[PDB]
Design a protein around this ligand. Structure first.
Ligand SMILES: CC(C)CCC[C@@H](C)[C@H]1CC[C@H]2[C@@H]3CC=C4C[C@@H](O)CC[C@]4(C)[C@H]3CC[C@]12C
Lengths: 339, 226, 258, 233, 56
């Protein structure tokens, strides 16, 4: 059986990568970063409460101008808020009520949402007709859209539930690059600050670092045990942190190909639903299923506070690009802005 | 007062947007949502054609001043847990089992049956965390082909512990009770089991009666009586 | 008679805190159904009634201890009566809404107007206000003078209105109970039946007797002067117990049970 | 996107005439509306403002309580009802479209106008330092407009607008909120200015920049224009 | 054809295994150095004064 010798070839390749990583790591993050004095406690007050969603919210994304944010929900509604003055800038009605993700374009002219209808539709905010209309429907996946993020006004990567990430091209309509290699249910997605790489998480507890330019899986990170739910880069671009269903949040590293710290706690027994990083990268914020977000000192693995404000499961979370505030959505249908 | 003219018009634009979200939520909270489930070729398409006249498939039908939405999810060949937590708060579940598939072993992994996979599916859906109060409207499909297939072959192939003389009544009642036994909690949920065929003329009334019971419970929940 | 006055002061302060928290929560920081309008207006009537109970408590306590001998205005009892009648009418219409939710389920889900709760609240408040200001005018609390002979005929018809509200409460509760215990399947029978009886017994034992003794006993007995020294403080304590228990029954155990 | 305006013409003094403006091509139910008039030789002058959903209506103090603005949402048609047509209401009536959310560009699309020939001390006044500037093409120009009160609100937005009227054409929008270009306007235009002092800097002028340039404030109501500077070749 | 799938998987592993990695302590120092050098421009660690808070 040539498949058996091919499998033992792959097994010794696993062995080589395992001892390469083991010889690669000498000191952890916590041994060399124990000597920095900790933050301590952080008291973030709910500065705003954006209400107007009626069913559960699974998605949120901040603007690059750090003032407008978009949010998606199961009442078929995509709402752009003015986070300073709680005003609803726009309210987009969706053709499919089952949406699991949303993005807000870096230029600010587009939003994209997609869900169980296997289509990450794209909506045009800036219109001469005054209304938000749908511009392109990106129908090429056979599993549900778990994440879709804009690279540019014309390019968008779409994580999907059919194990496949896909670089798209909004002008034509067709996926120029297809990213395969995960074995179950790709759940999340995070773009590099230079937007030339991206990571993704799946339900085989593996985080794969990709390459937008050619379309290959450059690295693979396996340190979890349960299904990865959300993922995020460190702001420097060299590291990323992820969160899975085993109440464990891990900070992996691109340039060393390694896990740096585990941000688990002995008291937490519910799955992370969303993660994000602060502007300096000092804080890691993780949404949770026990209804409240937890802030973590990213360099000491200490919980620096709890953003307890929600009645139901925190589903989505994000820090602004100026680092000013944190918006958390939840299943009780209330965005809260913390500062 | 301490606002501009433009920020004043922004505030009233947001108030109009609030108003339209309120109307659309009141419209969408008075319609009945049903999650249609089942195995492969269980007769789900048959009852879609009965109640009517890629990705998720949604069916709109109305019946006696009640507007229904029925969400077929058979095309979702993915992990069930994520998109099944997206489906809580649904009024009822229409679960489809074909009676005639008791002796049909599965087309893939030939050691395994349709009926025991349908039992495994029913156990996972009924004992779910997200469906602890949801009334399951079980539909038992193809009674006619079950008659011409139980006149010739016994049900002891699928249920050897069954002890009956292979007629229309007791074999169907045994497999009905075998499906009903799959609850851990028989006091929260209410399972509504029906027998039907493609020729059967009125079985949307069964769904209507089950959702009228669920609507009574939700009307009492909305009046504080829970 | 000092300890009934202290008791109604304590129960009225508790009812103030409960109805104020209900008013803030349902007015600003929570969503409202088509049913929470009734709870909000019942808490408003409740707040008005127990504020006037505190000030009628406090003027008596001042004239007892400090000997200030202040005078409360004569038309404050009219608005206190309006608050009490509006509170009992909210109780009756809550029972009627629960009965219509069960007996007509498809109508209550799909075809109920969204403004019906506000329309019913405005009509019942206006009718209670109308009969209270009419009683205050024709009986000597409004515009400084009144005749007892035309006071009695309208005080009896307001007592008849109270009895009509009580029988509407009982009829709707009985219809709801027979429809649930006869033809229902998936419901929590026991807690629902106990809460229906709790609402009816709280109504009969607490809200109704104060109106009966002011509206009706005061005139029919003709010897109420000896009775008032004992009957008038325990009855208004009972109505204050209704007032402090209405937010707990109709909002707190309903929604804040989680 | 077109706003064709009907009605208008030669009327009698003290008469009545309903001017109309039928929108077609956009979601007119989500747009605020204005009427802005100009005299045959003076600058522009704001008339009224009805918003989306007809909730909020202001008027010019010259004609408050005598005009009547009214929108129709299903048919997408805008009305101005005028009664007792005095002789100071001979003007060119423009149907202006505007929309107010964060990042929006009010006063962007204007109607073709309609002529109607007929035979306030706290208002922030806009002063234009000239009315005619002779400029050769390819030359950098600076048009100045002066306020009477600081237009920098506490939120940060400086509600100053720069319009343009080609001779024979309807007005367009160039600069909204003192520093932001409109869409379709070439990037050679650049307005800037501190509190009460504003300069619109045209650079590399061509033949299509010849016209009259208006500075409107939008801090308060009424909206007040400057005189306008007719650029010439 | 599982032979093709296993061959594609093993070519993916043989191109992934031949990469160069830095020491983990160097990366840890780089993460800590970015967090030190950008700590002033972070409005979430320290409570920024309310004049330049845009959120109340
Ligand atoms: C007819 C007029 C004179 C009666 C005035 C009644 C006054 C005192 C007040 C007291 C509390 C008020 C209610 C408080 C709550 C609301 C909820 C709001 O969404 C609709 C109006 C409604 C229902 C108000 C109606 C008017 C009301 C009952």
């Amino acid at each position: 059986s040539e498949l058996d010798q091919l499998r033992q070839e792959a097994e010794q390749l696993k062995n080589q990568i395992r001892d390469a990583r083991k010889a690669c790591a000498d000191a952890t993050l916590s041994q060399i970063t124990n000597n920095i004095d900790p933050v301590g406690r952080i008291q973030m007050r709910t500065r705003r409460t954006l209400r107007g969603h009626l069913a559960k919210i699974y998605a949120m994304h901040w603007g690059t101008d750090s003032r407008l944010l978009v949010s998606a929900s199961q009442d078929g509604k995509l709402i752009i808020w003015d986070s300073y003055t709680t005003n609803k800038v726009h309210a987009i009605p969706l053709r499919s009520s089952w949406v699991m993700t949303c993005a807000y374009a870096p230029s600010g002219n587009y939003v994209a949402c997609g869900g169980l209808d296997n289509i990450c539709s794209i909506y045009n905010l800036k219109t001469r007709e005054g209304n938000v209309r749908v511009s392109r429907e990106l129908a090429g996946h056979t599993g549900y859209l778990s994440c879709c993020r804009f690279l540019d006004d014309n390019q968008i990567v779409t994580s999907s539930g059919d194990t496949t990430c896909a670089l798209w091209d909004i002008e034509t309509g067709q996926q120029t690059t297809t990213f395969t290699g995960h074995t179950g249910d790709v759940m999340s997605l995070s773009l590099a600050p230079d937007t030339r790489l991206f990571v993704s998480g799946a339900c085989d507890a593996s985080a794969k670092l990709w390459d937008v330019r050619e379309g290959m899986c450059r690295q693979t990170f396996t340190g979890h045990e349960s299904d990865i739910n959300a993922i995020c880069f460190f702001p420097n671009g060299n590291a990323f942190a992820t969160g899975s269903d085993d109440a464990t949040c891990r900070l992996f590293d691109l340039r060393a190909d390694q896990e740096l710290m585990t941000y688990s706690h002995d008291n937490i027994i519910c799955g992370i639903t969303s993660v994000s990083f602060s502007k300096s990268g000092r804080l890691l914020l993780a949404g949770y299923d026990d209804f409240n977000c937890n802030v973590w000192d990213a360099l000491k693995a200490d919980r620096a506070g709890v953003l307890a404000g929600h009645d139901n499961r925190v589903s989505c979370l994000g820090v602004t690009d100026d680092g000013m505030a944190v918006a958390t959505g939840s299943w009780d249908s209330f965005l809260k802005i913390w500062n | 007062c301490t606002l501009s003219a433009e920020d004043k018009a922004a505030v009233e634009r947001s108030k109009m947007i609030d108003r339209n979200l309120r109307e659309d939520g009141e419209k969408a909270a008075r319609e009945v949502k049903l999650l249609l489930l089942g195995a492969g070729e269980s007769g789900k398409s048959t009852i879609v054609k009965q109640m009517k006249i890629t990705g998720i498939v949604e069916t709109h039908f109305t019946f006696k001043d009640l507007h229904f939405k029925m969400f077929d999810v058979g095309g979702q060949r993915s992990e069930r847990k994520k998109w099944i937590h997206c489906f809580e708060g649904v009024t009822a579940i229409i679960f489809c089992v074909a009676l005639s598939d008791y002796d049909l072993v599965l087309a893939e992994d030939e050691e395994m049956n349709r009926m025991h996979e349908s039992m495994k599916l029913f156990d996972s859906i009924c004992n779910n965390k997200w469906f602890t109060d949801t009334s399951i409207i079980l539909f038992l499909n193809k009674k006619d082909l079950f008659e011409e297939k139980i006149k010739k072959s016994p049900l002891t192939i699928c249920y050897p512990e069954y002890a009956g003389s292979n007629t229309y009544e007791e074999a169907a009642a045994y497999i009905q009770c075998q499906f009903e036994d799959l609850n851990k909690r028989k006091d929260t949920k209410e399972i509504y089991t029906h027998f039907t065929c493609a020729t059967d003329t009125k079985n949307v009334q069964f769904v209507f009666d089950a959702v009228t019971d669920v609507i009574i419970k939700n009307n009492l929940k909305d009046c504080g009586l829970f | 008679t000092l300890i009934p006055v202290f008791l109604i002061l304590f129960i009225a302060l508790v009812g103030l805190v409960g109805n104020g928290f209900v008013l803030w929560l349902l007015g600003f920081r929570m969503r409202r159904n088509a049913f929470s309008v009734y709870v909000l207006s019942l808490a408003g009537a409740d707040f008005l009634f127990l504020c006037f109970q505190i000030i009628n408590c406090l003027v008596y306590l001042s004239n007892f201890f400090c000997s200030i001998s202040i005078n409360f205005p004569s038309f404050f009892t009219t608005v206190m009566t309006c608050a009490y009648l509006a509170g009992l009418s909210m109780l009756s219409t809550v029972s009627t809404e629960r009965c219509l939710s069960v007996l007509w389920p498809i109508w209550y889900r799909c075809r109920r107007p969204r403004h019906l709760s506000a329309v019913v609240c405005v009509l019942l408040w206006a009718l209670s206000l109308l009969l209270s200001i009419l009683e205050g005018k024709f009986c000597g609390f409004l515009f400084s003078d009144g005749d007892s002979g035309w006071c009695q005929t309208f005080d009896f018809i307001t007592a008849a209105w109270l009895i009509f509200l009580f029988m509407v409460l009982c009829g709707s509760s009985l219809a709801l109970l027979v429809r649930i215990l006869c033809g229902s399947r998936g419901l929590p029978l026991t807690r629902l039946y106990l809460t229906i009886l709790l609402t009816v017994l709280v109504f009969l034992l607490c809200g109704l007797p104060f109106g009966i003794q002011w509206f009706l006993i005061l005139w029919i007995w003709k010897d109420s002067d000896v009775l008032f020294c004992h009957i008038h403080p325990v009855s208004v304590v009972l109505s204050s117990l209704n007032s402090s228990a209405n937010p707990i029954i109709y909002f707190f155990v309903g929604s804040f049970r989680k | 996107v077109q706003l064709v305006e009907s009605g208008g013409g030669l009327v009698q003094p003290g008469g009545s005439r309903k001017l109309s403006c039928s929108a077609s091509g956009f979601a007119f139910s989500s747009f605020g509306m204005h009427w802005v008039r100009q005299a045959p030789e003076k600058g522009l002058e704001w008339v009224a403002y009805i918003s989306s959903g007809s909730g909020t209506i202001y008027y010019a103090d010259t004609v408050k309580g005598r005009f009547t603005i009214s929108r129709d949402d299903p048919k997408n048609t805008l009305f101005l009802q005028m009664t007792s047509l005095r002789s100071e209401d001979t003007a060119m009536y423009y149907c202006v479209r505007s929309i107010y959310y964060y990042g929006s560009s009010p006063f962007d699309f204007w109607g073709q106008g309609t002529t109607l020939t007929v035979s306030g001390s706290a208002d922030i006044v806009m002063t234009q330092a000239t009315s005619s500037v002779p400029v050769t093409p390819g030359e950098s120009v600076s048009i100045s407009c002066r306020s009477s009160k600081s237009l920098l609100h506490s939120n940060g937005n400086t509600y100053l607008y720069w319009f343009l009227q080609r001779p024979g054409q309807s007005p367009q929008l160039l600069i909204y909120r003192m520093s932001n270009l409109a869409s379709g306007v070439p990037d050679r235009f650049s307005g800037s200015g501190s509190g009460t002092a504003f300069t619109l800097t045209i650079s590399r002028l061509e033949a299509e920049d010849v016209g009259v340039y208006y500075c409107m404030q939008h801090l308060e109501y009424p909206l007040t224009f400057g005189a306008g500077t007719k650029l010439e070749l | 054809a599982s032979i093709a799938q296993a061959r594609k998987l093993v070519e993916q592993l043989k191109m992934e295994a031949n990469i160069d990695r830095i020491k983990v302590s160097k990366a840890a120092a780089d993460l800590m150095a970015y967090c030190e050098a950008h700590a002033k421009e972070d409005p979430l660690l320290t409570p920024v004064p309310a004049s330049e808070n845009p959120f109340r």
